[PDB]
Amino acid sequence: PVQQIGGNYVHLPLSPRTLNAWVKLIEEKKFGAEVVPGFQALSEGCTPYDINQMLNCVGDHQAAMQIIRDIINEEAADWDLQHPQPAQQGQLREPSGSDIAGTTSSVDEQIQWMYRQQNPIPVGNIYRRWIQLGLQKCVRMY
């Protein structure tokens, strides 16, 4: 997530312990249900970068990544259209679907987007609850 240093916002990364307590939620509960909110709780206030950091920690128990990516693109699609860029220079770009998901953006951008004065956009808590929707998918598969 992010910490404010004198009116300025700086990425504070996820403490190791804060990933552990999460990797453990799977391997000890292995999806199911207790993870949908479990994740949501850890997910609180993160950037797209952070969310990603979490997932890579469990690309071994990976039989579920494929369907989550499915919804991300499904919604990224819904996004690259409804709110398009639609275009520049100097000013930071408008966040596409690949941006919001953290795959074509830096964390600086993601913060630059979450906390801009003129029209701030919560990429964290947007992409965040794509992950939420893609997870119920997983859940039912049980």
Residue numbers in the entry: 1 to 87, 89 to 143
Give sentences from the paper.
To provide a relevant structural context for evaluating the mutagenesis results, we determined the structure of the SIVmac239 CA N-terminal domain. In particular, the five α-helices of the SIVmac239 N-terminal domain core did not deviate from those of HIV-1 or HIV-2, consistent with the observation that the SIV-HIVinterior chimera remained largely resistant to restriction. We compared the SIVmac239 CA N-terminal domain structure to all of the previously reported wild type HIV-1 and HIV-2 CA N-terminal domain structures in which the surface features were properly folded. Specifically, the 4–5 loops and β-hairpins formed two clusters; one composed of HIV-1 structures, and the other composed of SIVmac239 and HIV-2 structures. Measurements between the HIV-1 Cα of Gly94 or Gln95 and the corresponding Gly91 and Gln92 of SIVmac239 indicate that these two groups are separated by 3.3–11 Å in the structural alignment. Similarly, measurements between the Cα of HIV-1 Gly8 and the homologous SIVmac239/HIV-2 Gly7 show the two groups are separated by 4–8.5 Å in the structural alignment. The SIVmac239 4–5 loop, like that of HIV-2, is positioned further over the conserved surface patch than that of most HIV-1 loops. Structurally, the surface patch was conserved across SIVmac239, HIV-1 and HIV-2. The C-terminus or the 4–5 loop, helix 5 and helix 6 were in very close agreement with the structures of HIV-1 and HIV-2, indicative of strong selection to preserve the overall architecture and amino acid composition of this site.
